[PDB]
C-alpha cells in the first residue's frame, strides 16, 4: 500500500464486462459515474492502481474519509471520477508463519497531497531532538509490515484493491468501450445505424 | 488533564501470574510510549521494558524476561503489563510512566507517572492482627519521661493504622513501619513518650485498624 | 548491561551548603539521554534534569547537570529544606534503561547521644502466649547505630527486628526501635534481658537491663 | 488619527460622587463599542463596563454593580462613566477603550484596538501633610568593601509624591529612590539611598533634597556619619 | 465567570530564544481568546485575536494557537522591544476577566546581594516610633527573602518590603525591608537582626546590631 | 441588507414569500446583480443577535 | 439493508411501470437454474447507507 | 461492549437549584445518547433524545448538550415532580446496555440516629437460631455505617442491612441491621455490640448488651 503501482491503459477498447465475474457478488462500488453505463460513454485516459490492505481500510479508502493508512498512503482527492475494485485474497496472500512482504506506513509529519508518490524510509524525528539516524526513545522506524495468517478473522484478512481513475482532456477520446453489432437483414424496411450514419 | 491511572493493590500467591493495568487520559495516547518501573521498599528502581503505543514493538531486559508480557488496547487507552511465575522477590510497587505529548509534539522526557500498584506475593492468607500493649514500668522511665506502646503482630496485609485515644494523643507518637516476619506476617510497633507524672491519671488507648481483615482492636495500656 | 552506581551514599549537609551529586556509568551512553529524578518519602519521583544538561519545567535554576561519557554530575547551587530527598539518575538511550543507586541528601549537625529505653513484655501480652522486649533509641544524630540483644548475658541473633523513622525536621533527631520476639515459654525460660547500644555519640556502650522478678 | 482622551479624574473623598469623561476623535463613534478598564497599582488590570452602539446592551462587573452607570451620547461623541458612593477599591487608573464590532461580546471576533492614556482616580480621606525626612546616617554597619551606604527616609505624607534629589542634582551615580508604600496610618513613605566611597566620609557633604508640591514643603536634610 | 490562570508568572529570557506562555481556563470558551502587551508605563496593545489571527502591523515573530481549554502565545524570536507583560482574556460570556499577567525578564549575570542594616535614628525615636531598615542591594534575581529576628525570635506581620525596578546600568535590583515598632517596644529589646535568603548567597547572612552599642 | 439562509431565494424577480412580499421586493423589469455570502462568523451571537 | 435497487435486467422498462421480479439473470448461454456463479448474477443489490 | 457509567450515584438538591448528571462512557459513541426518568414505582419516561432535542410535552427546564464521549443532562430549575431516578442510554450499536442510574434526593438539616439493640427472643432461641437487631431511627443522611462486635471482636459476613424509604412526614430514614447466629454460637459468647458511625454523631455510638444480664 505504501508503494503502490501505476499503469497507463491507453489505445485500446475496454471490456468492463469481464470484471463482474470476479468475487461472489462483488465489492464493486463506483463513485462519480453510473457503474452500468460506462461502456457506451468515451473517455480520454484510464489510470489504474493496485495494492493490498486489510478489511477496514477498504472503507478507509473512500474519498474524503480520513484514516492513518488512507491519509498517509493513498489519499484519494475530493473530486474523483473513477472507482475501485476489491475482493478477498486470503487464499493466495496468507502465510501460516506470517507474511512479511506487505508493509504499511503509520505516522508522518503531515498528510500527502492527492496522488503523491512517497517511498520515504528515513528515521523519523518525532521530537525536536535530532535522532541522527539511530533508533531509540522518541525515534521510531516508520515502516511496519502486516502479518497475514489463516487463523486471523475476516477483519484482519488481506484484501486486494484495484483503483481506476477516469479523466477527460482535449484528446480525441481513445480508450473507451466496445460497440456490439447485430445481424444484417435485406429487402425489408428497417431503420439502421451504420457506424454513425442513420 | 494529563494523568495516568493504575489498578488497585493486589495480593497473589507465589508461582502464579499477576495483571497490572495503567489507563491514560488527557493526551494523545496513540503518539506516546509506556515505561514500566518496579520499586520495592528501599530497593532499586528497575526496568521492565518499554513499548511504542503507536507501533506496539516490545523489548525486555535480560533480568526480567520470558515471564513479562506487555499488551495495549487503543479503545480503552489503557496500558497492560503481565507478569507470570511470581516469587517472593516480586512483591514491590509497579509504576507506569509515559512522556506527555501536548499536541503533535512530545516532551523529550517522561513526566507523567502513575500512583503505583501494590502487588504482594505470599502464600499466607488474610488474618486479623493480634495487638498487645507495652505496659510502662519503672524500667521504661528516665528523667521524668515515661514511654508506653502497643505491639501489632501477625497481619498478612499491613495497612495497620494506629491512632491513640481516638486521635486525641498525637505528640510524641512513633508508629514504625511494618517488618515482615519469617512466618510471612507483618508486625509493627507504636510507642509514645509521656511524662512520668501522667501515669495513673491519664488513660492511654491504642486504636488498631486493619481494614483487609476487617478487624478493630483497642487495648488498654 | 549498563549499570549505574552513585558513590556518595550520604550527603549530610546544611540548608544552603554546596551540594554535589555523582552518577557513575559502567559503560558510556549518548550525551543527552540521562535523567535526574528527586523522590520524597511517600511521593512519586519527579524529573529534574533531562539531556544531562537541561532543566525541566518549574525546576529552579539552582539545579544543574553536567558531564559526558561515563561520569555525570548533578549540581544544586543552594540547598533548600524541600530539596533534602533521594536523587536518582536514569539512562534513556541504551537498550536497557536502569536507575542509579540514589543519593540521600540529609541535614548535618553535631553528634547527639541517644536516650535508651527498654520495655518488658506486658501482662496482657504474656496472657496470649507471646512476649516481646523493645529497646527504644531516641534523639541521636547519626541515623544508624548498633543494637545487640543479650539474654542472660548471651548474645541473641536472628530474633530481633529494628525499625527506623525519618529524620526529624525540628531538632535533627533520628529514632530507632528494636523488638526481640520470643514465645512465652522461651521468655519465661530466661532471667535477664538486656539491649546494648554502641552508638557513636555514646562514649561507652550503654546497656539497659531488667530482671523478670523485679517487675 | 484614531485617538481617545480621558478626563474627569482626581482625588475624591468617600461619600462623594464623580463623573469621568471619554473623548472620541479620529473614528466614527455611532458604530463602535466602548468599554471601561481600570488598573490599580501592581494588580494587573480589571474590566469596568461595556456599552453597545445602540445603547441596548449595558453590563457591569458584579464587584461594581449598583454604584456605577455608563452612558454615551452621539452628539458630542463621548462616553460617560458615572460614579456613585465611591469607596477604597475605586482607587485605580481608568482606561477608556474602543471595540471594533459595535457590541461588547458574543461575536467570534472582538478586541480592544485602541487604549487611551487614562486618568488617575484616588479615593481617600486625604489631608495634606508635609513630609518628615530623617537621615540614614552612615556607620560601621553600612560600610562594606570601601563603600558607604547612606540615604534619607521620607515619612508621613497623604499626597503620594516627593521628588528626591541629592546635592541639588550634583549626585546621581548610585542613587536609588524606592517607590512609595502606603503605611497603615494612610500616609506614604519611601527611602532614597546613594552609595559613596568610604574615603569621602568627612570630606564631602551630602544633602538630600525632598520636594512635596501639594503641601508646598521643601526640606534639605544633611546626612552625617554617626559620631559615637 | 470563567477563571483564567497564567502558568508562568515570570520568565527570564535572552535575545534569540523562544518564549511560550499558557492561558488556562476552567470551562470551554472555544477559540475566543486574544492577548495584549503593555509597555513600561504605557497602555496595553493588542497583538493577536481569535488566538490565531494577527491584527495589523505586528511583527511576524509573534504567533499563537489554541484549542478547547488551552491557549498558548509563542514568540519565535526575541527583540529588545519584546520585553513586557502579556495578558490573556476570555470572550465567551458577557462578563470579561483579564489575566494576572506574565512578566518577561532580561538576562544578566547573577550577583550576590549586599546586606546592610540601619538602626532607628534618634530623631524618629523622639517621635515615639521606631523603624529599622535592612538594605538589600545589587542583586539580579528579584526573588529575595528577608526574615526579621528580634532577640533571636522570628518577627512576622510588622515588616514591609519594597523592590526597585531593574537598574539600567548593571541590571541589579534593590530591596529594602523596614520593621516598624513602637518606641517602648523597640526599647524593650536589645538585639535586632535581618536574615537574607538569596540564591547567590552561600549561606543565610544575618546582620545584627545592639541597641546599647554604638 | 441581511437575511437568513432559507429566504435567499425570496430576493429575486417572480418569487413570493414573507420577505419578498413585505421586506424587500424587486421589480419585474430588473437589470442588476445580487451578491450574498454567509455571515455566521461575523453576525452570530452565542446569546443571540 | 432495507433499501434495495435493481442492476441487471433483460430489457428497458416502459414508462410508469413497476417490476418486483427476483429471478437470476443469465448473461451467458449456459443456463443457471437459479444457482450459479459464472455469467449468472442475482438481479438485486442492496444499498448500505452510513 | 461499551461500558457506560454515571459519576454521581446520589445527589441531594433543593428547589430552584441546578442539577447536573455526568454520564461517561469508554469508546466514542458520537451523539447516540438519551436520558430516561423513572417515576417512583412507575415506568421510566423519555426526557431527551439525540442529546439535544426535546421530544414532546417536556418542561423547558430540562436541557442537555455534549460531544463525543461527554454529555451533560442539566436541570435549570427544580420542581416537586422532578424528584426521581435518571438513566442514560447509549445507542451506537446492538449490545444496548443501561447505565447504573442517578438518584436525586431532597435537601434538609442533618439529624442524629437513635441506636437501639434487641437481643434474640426466647422463642427464637428455642428454634436453635438467634438474631440480634440493631435499629437506626431518624438519620437524615441516608449514609450510615454499622459494625457488629462480639466479645470486643468485630464480626464480618453475618449481618444484613435493610433501610426504609424516606418518611413522608419528617423525611427520616430507618436502618435495621440483623446479626444472625446459631444458638450454640450465640451461647458461646457474652457481649454483643453494634457500633454506628453517622454524620450527625460526633463520635461512634455503640449499644451493647450482655447475654447473662436481663
mmCIF file with all atom_site columns, C-alpha atoms in Angstrom, chain B residues 35 37 39 43-47 50 59 61 63 95 107-111 113-114 132-135 137 139-142 145 147-148 151 153 174-177 179-182 187 189 191 193 219-221, chain C residues 1 37 39 44-45 47 50 56-57 88 90 92 95-102 117-120 122 124-125 128 130-132 134 136 138 161-165 175-177 179 181 210-212 214-215:
data_model
loop_
_atom_site.group_PDB
_atom_site.id
_atom_site.type_symbol
_atom_site.label_atom_id
_atom_site.label_alt_id
_atom_site.label_comp_id
_atom_site.label_asym_id
_atom_site.label_entity_id
_atom_site.label_seq_id
_atom_site.pdbx_PDB_ins_code
_atom_site.Cartn_x
_atom_site.Cartn_y
_atom_site.Cartn_z
_atom_site.occupancy
_atom_site.B_iso_or_equiv
_atom_site.pdbx_formal_charge
_atom_site.auth_seq_id
_atom_site.auth_comp_id
_atom_site.auth_asym_id
_atom_site.auth_atom_id
_atom_site.pdbx_PDB_model_num
ATOM 1  C CA . UNK B 1 35  ? 7.587  2.559   30.587 1.00 0.00 ? 35  UNK B CA 1
ATOM 2  C CA . UNK B 1 37  ? 9.275  0.679   36.593 1.00 0.00 ? 37  UNK B CA 1
ATOM 3  C CA . UNK B 1 39  ? 10.335 -0.349  43.142 1.00 0.00 ? 39  UNK B CA 1
ATOM 4  C CA . UNK B 1 43  ? 15.397 -1.178  46.742 1.00 0.00 ? 43  UNK B CA 1
ATOM 5  C CA . UNK B 1 44  ? 16.298 -0.281  43.146 1.00 0.00 ? 44  UNK B CA 1
ATOM 6  C CA . UNK B 1 45  ? 14.090 1.366   40.574 1.00 0.00 ? 45  UNK B CA 1
ATOM 7  C CA . UNK B 1 46  ? 14.324 -1.330  37.925 1.00 0.00 ? 46  UNK B CA 1
ATOM 8  C CA . UNK B 1 47  ? 13.437 -1.676  34.254 1.00 0.00 ? 47  UNK B CA 1
ATOM 9  C CA . UNK B 1 50  ? 9.004  -0.124  27.201 1.00 0.00 ? 50  UNK B CA 1
ATOM 10 C CA . UNK B 1 59  ? 11.591 -5.155  24.299 1.00 0.00 ? 59  UNK B CA 1
ATOM 11 C CA . UNK B 1 61  ? 15.617 -6.746  29.818 1.00 0.00 ? 61  UNK B CA 1
ATOM 12 C CA . UNK B 1 63  ? 16.912 -9.825  34.101 1.00 0.00 ? 63  UNK B CA 1
ATOM 13 C CA . UNK B 1 95  ? 4.801  2.238   38.224 1.00 0.00 ? 95  UNK B CA 1
ATOM 14 C CA . UNK B 1 107 ? 8.118  16.170  25.548 1.00 0.00 ? 107 UNK B CA 1
ATOM 15 C CA . UNK B 1 108 ? 11.569 14.575  25.341 1.00 0.00 ? 108 UNK B CA 1
ATOM 16 C CA . UNK B 1 109 ? 11.323 13.073  28.848 1.00 0.00 ? 109 UNK B CA 1
ATOM 17 C CA . UNK B 1 110 ? 8.957  11.031  30.981 1.00 0.00 ? 110 UNK B CA 1
ATOM 18 C CA . UNK B 1 111 ? 6.784  13.393  33.028 1.00 0.00 ? 111 UNK B CA 1
ATOM 19 C CA . UNK B 1 113 ? 3.907  8.906   36.340 1.00 0.00 ? 113 UNK B CA 1
ATOM 20 C CA . UNK B 1 114 ? 1.204  6.756   37.892 1.00 0.00 ? 114 UNK B CA 1
ATOM 21 C CA . UNK B 1 132 ? -0.503 -6.355  72.633 1.00 0.00 ? 132 UNK B CA 1
ATOM 22 C CA . UNK B 1 133 ? 0.229  -3.225  74.701 1.00 0.00 ? 133 UNK B CA 1
ATOM 23 C CA . UNK B 1 134 ? 3.677  -2.372  76.070 1.00 0.00 ? 134 UNK B CA 1
ATOM 24 C CA . UNK B 1 135 ? 2.823  -1.598  79.691 1.00 0.00 ? 135 UNK B CA 1
ATOM 25 C CA . UNK B 1 137 ? 7.133  0.329   84.310 1.00 0.00 ? 137 UNK B CA 1
ATOM 26 C CA . UNK B 1 139 ? 12.412 0.339   83.891 1.00 0.00 ? 139 UNK B CA 1
ATOM 27 C CA . UNK B 1 140 ? 10.977 2.328   80.950 1.00 0.00 ? 140 UNK B CA 1
ATOM 28 C CA . UNK B 1 141 ? 11.152 5.690   82.768 1.00 0.00 ? 141 UNK B CA 1
ATOM 29 C CA . UNK B 1 142 ? 14.130 8.060   82.756 1.00 0.00 ? 142 UNK B CA 1
ATOM 30 C CA . UNK B 1 145 ? 9.555  10.802  80.946 1.00 0.00 ? 145 UNK B CA 1
ATOM 31 C CA . UNK B 1 147 ? 7.205  5.554   77.403 1.00 0.00 ? 147 UNK B CA 1
ATOM 32 C CA . UNK B 1 148 ? 4.448  3.056   76.601 1.00 0.00 ? 148 UNK B CA 1
ATOM 33 C CA . UNK B 1 151 ? 2.527  -4.047  69.550 1.00 0.00 ? 151 UNK B CA 1
ATOM 34 C CA . UNK B 1 153 ? 1.652  -8.741  65.384 1.00 0.00 ? 153 UNK B CA 1
ATOM 35 C CA . UNK B 1 174 ? 6.069  6.980   66.874 1.00 0.00 ? 174 UNK B CA 1
ATOM 36 C CA . UNK B 1 175 ? 4.467  4.398   64.582 1.00 0.00 ? 175 UNK B CA 1
ATOM 37 C CA . UNK B 1 176 ? 7.205  2.340   62.972 1.00 0.00 ? 176 UNK B CA 1
ATOM 38 C CA . UNK B 1 177 ? 6.926  0.717   59.529 1.00 0.00 ? 177 UNK B CA 1
ATOM 39 C CA . UNK B 1 179 ? 8.561  -5.640  59.355 1.00 0.00 ? 179 UNK B CA 1
ATOM 40 C CA . UNK B 1 180 ? 7.942  -8.963  57.622 1.00 0.00 ? 180 UNK B CA 1
ATOM 41 C CA . UNK B 1 181 ? 8.436  -11.913 59.961 1.00 0.00 ? 181 UNK B CA 1
ATOM 42 C CA . UNK B 1 182 ? 9.790  -15.314 58.966 1.00 0.00 ? 182 UNK B CA 1
ATOM 43 C CA . UNK B 1 187 ? 4.416  -6.656  62.600 1.00 0.00 ? 187 UNK B CA 1
ATOM 44 C CA . UNK B 1 189 ? 5.396  -1.112  66.988 1.00 0.00 ? 189 UNK B CA 1
ATOM 45 C CA . UNK B 1 191 ? 5.009  3.948   71.160 1.00 0.00 ? 191 UNK B CA 1
ATOM 46 C CA . UNK B 1 193 ? 6.775  9.466   75.183 1.00 0.00 ? 193 UNK B CA 1
ATOM 47 C CA . UNK B 1 219 ? -6.285 -2.419  74.086 1.00 0.00 ? 219 UNK B CA 1
ATOM 48 C CA . UNK B 1 220 ? -5.769 -0.826  77.491 1.00 0.00 ? 220 UNK B CA 1
ATOM 49 C CA . UNK B 1 221 ? -2.184 0.119   78.335 1.00 0.00 ? 221 UNK B CA 1
ATOM 50 C CA . UNK C 2 1   ? 24.072 -4.242  30.981 1.00 0.00 ? 1   UNK C CA 1
ATOM 51 C CA . UNK C 2 37  ? 14.720 12.310  39.486 1.00 0.00 ? 37  UNK C CA 1
ATOM 52 C CA . UNK C 2 39  ? 11.893 11.403  45.283 1.00 0.00 ? 39  UNK C CA 1
ATOM 53 C CA . UNK C 2 44  ? 6.291  9.754   43.281 1.00 0.00 ? 44  UNK C CA 1
ATOM 54 C CA . UNK C 2 45  ? 9.604  10.678  41.610 1.00 0.00 ? 45  UNK C CA 1
ATOM 55 C CA . UNK C 2 47  ? 12.160 14.772  36.793 1.00 0.00 ? 47  UNK C CA 1
ATOM 56 C CA . UNK C 2 50  ? 16.862 15.761  31.101 1.00 0.00 ? 50  UNK C CA 1
ATOM 57 C CA . UNK C 2 56  ? 12.749 20.638  33.445 1.00 0.00 ? 56  UNK C CA 1
ATOM 58 C CA . UNK C 2 57  ? 9.759  22.961  33.640 1.00 0.00 ? 57  UNK C CA 1
ATOM 59 C CA . UNK C 2 88  ? 18.001 9.125   41.074 1.00 0.00 ? 88  UNK C CA 1
ATOM 60 C CA . UNK C 2 90  ? 18.448 7.070   34.858 1.00 0.00 ? 90  UNK C CA 1
ATOM 61 C CA . UNK C 2 92  ? 17.433 6.909   28.212 1.00 0.00 ? 92  UNK C CA 1
ATOM 62 C CA . UNK C 2 95  ? 18.573 -0.987  25.182 1.00 0.00 ? 95  UNK C CA 1
ATOM 63 C CA . UNK C 2 96  ? 18.278 -1.185  28.993 1.00 0.00 ? 96  UNK C CA 1
ATOM 64 C CA . UNK C 2 97  ? 17.216 1.864   30.980 1.00 0.00 ? 97  UNK C CA 1
ATOM 65 C CA . UNK C 2 98  ? 18.319 1.417   34.591 1.00 0.00 ? 98  UNK C CA 1
ATOM 66 C CA . UNK C 2 99  ? 18.441 3.756   37.583 1.00 0.00 ? 99  UNK C CA 1
ATOM 67 C CA . UNK C 2 100 ? 21.283 4.830   39.824 1.00 0.00 ? 100 UNK C CA 1
ATOM 68 C CA . UNK C 2 101 ? 21.943 3.940   43.450 1.00 0.00 ? 101 UNK C CA 1
ATOM 69 C CA . UNK C 2 102 ? 20.359 7.106   44.842 1.00 0.00 ? 102 UNK C CA 1
ATOM 70 C CA . UNK C 2 117 ? 14.640 2.773   76.953 1.00 0.00 ? 117 UNK C CA 1
ATOM 71 C CA . UNK C 2 118 ? 13.791 -0.914  77.398 1.00 0.00 ? 118 UNK C CA 1
ATOM 72 C CA . UNK C 2 119 ? 10.251 -2.301  77.628 1.00 0.00 ? 119 UNK C CA 1
ATOM 73 C CA . UNK C 2 120 ? 9.489  -5.623  79.354 1.00 0.00 ? 120 UNK C CA 1
ATOM 74 C CA . UNK C 2 122 ? 3.212  -6.649  79.400 1.00 0.00 ? 122 UNK C CA 1
ATOM 75 C CA . UNK C 2 124 ? -1.721 -8.725  78.641 1.00 0.00 ? 124 UNK C CA 1
ATOM 76 C CA . UNK C 2 125 ? 0.864  -9.735  76.035 1.00 0.00 ? 125 UNK C CA 1
ATOM 77 C CA . UNK C 2 128 ? -1.628 -14.585 74.787 1.00 0.00 ? 128 UNK C CA 1
ATOM 78 C CA . UNK C 2 130 ? 3.844  -14.200 73.290 1.00 0.00 ? 130 UNK C CA 1
ATOM 79 C CA . UNK C 2 131 ? 6.448  -11.838 74.727 1.00 0.00 ? 131 UNK C CA 1
ATOM 80 C CA . UNK C 2 132 ? 8.411  -9.050  73.037 1.00 0.00 ? 132 UNK C CA 1
ATOM 81 C CA . UNK C 2 134 ? 11.512 -3.417  72.915 1.00 0.00 ? 134 UNK C CA 1
ATOM 82 C CA . UNK C 2 136 ? 13.973 2.305   72.117 1.00 0.00 ? 136 UNK C CA 1
ATOM 83 C CA . UNK C 2 138 ? 15.638 8.420   70.937 1.00 0.00 ? 138 UNK C CA 1
ATOM 84 C CA . UNK C 2 161 ? 13.788 -6.698  64.174 1.00 0.00 ? 161 UNK C CA 1
ATOM 85 C CA . UNK C 2 162 ? 14.654 -2.997  64.049 1.00 0.00 ? 162 UNK C CA 1
ATOM 86 C CA . UNK C 2 163 ? 12.682 -0.113  62.558 1.00 0.00 ? 163 UNK C CA 1
ATOM 87 C CA . UNK C 2 164 ? 13.844 3.432   61.831 1.00 0.00 ? 164 UNK C CA 1
ATOM 88 C CA . UNK C 2 165 ? 11.775 6.562   61.256 1.00 0.00 ? 165 UNK C CA 1
ATOM 89 C CA . UNK C 2 175 ? 14.829 7.431   66.199 1.00 0.00 ? 175 UNK C CA 1
ATOM 90 C CA . UNK C 2 176 ? 15.151 3.628   66.384 1.00 0.00 ? 176 UNK C CA 1
ATOM 91 C CA . UNK C 2 177 ? 13.213 0.756   67.982 1.00 0.00 ? 177 UNK C CA 1
ATOM 92 C CA . UNK C 2 179 ? 11.971 -5.572  69.225 1.00 0.00 ? 179 UNK C CA 1
ATOM 93 C CA . UNK C 2 181 ? 10.189 -11.526 69.628 1.00 0.00 ? 181 UNK C CA 1
ATOM 94 C CA . UNK C 2 210 ? 15.980 -5.685  83.509 1.00 0.00 ? 210 UNK C CA 1
ATOM 95 C CA . UNK C 2 211 ? 15.047 -8.752  85.565 1.00 0.00 ? 211 UNK C CA 1
ATOM 96 C CA . UNK C 2 212 ? 11.732 -10.613 85.342 1.00 0.00 ? 212 UNK C CA 1
ATOM 97 C CA . UNK C 2 214 ? 11.916 -7.231  89.887 1.00 0.00 ? 214 UNK C CA 1
ATOM 98 C CA . UNK C 2 215 ? 8.915  -6.024  87.856 1.00 0.00 ? 215 UNK C CA 1
#
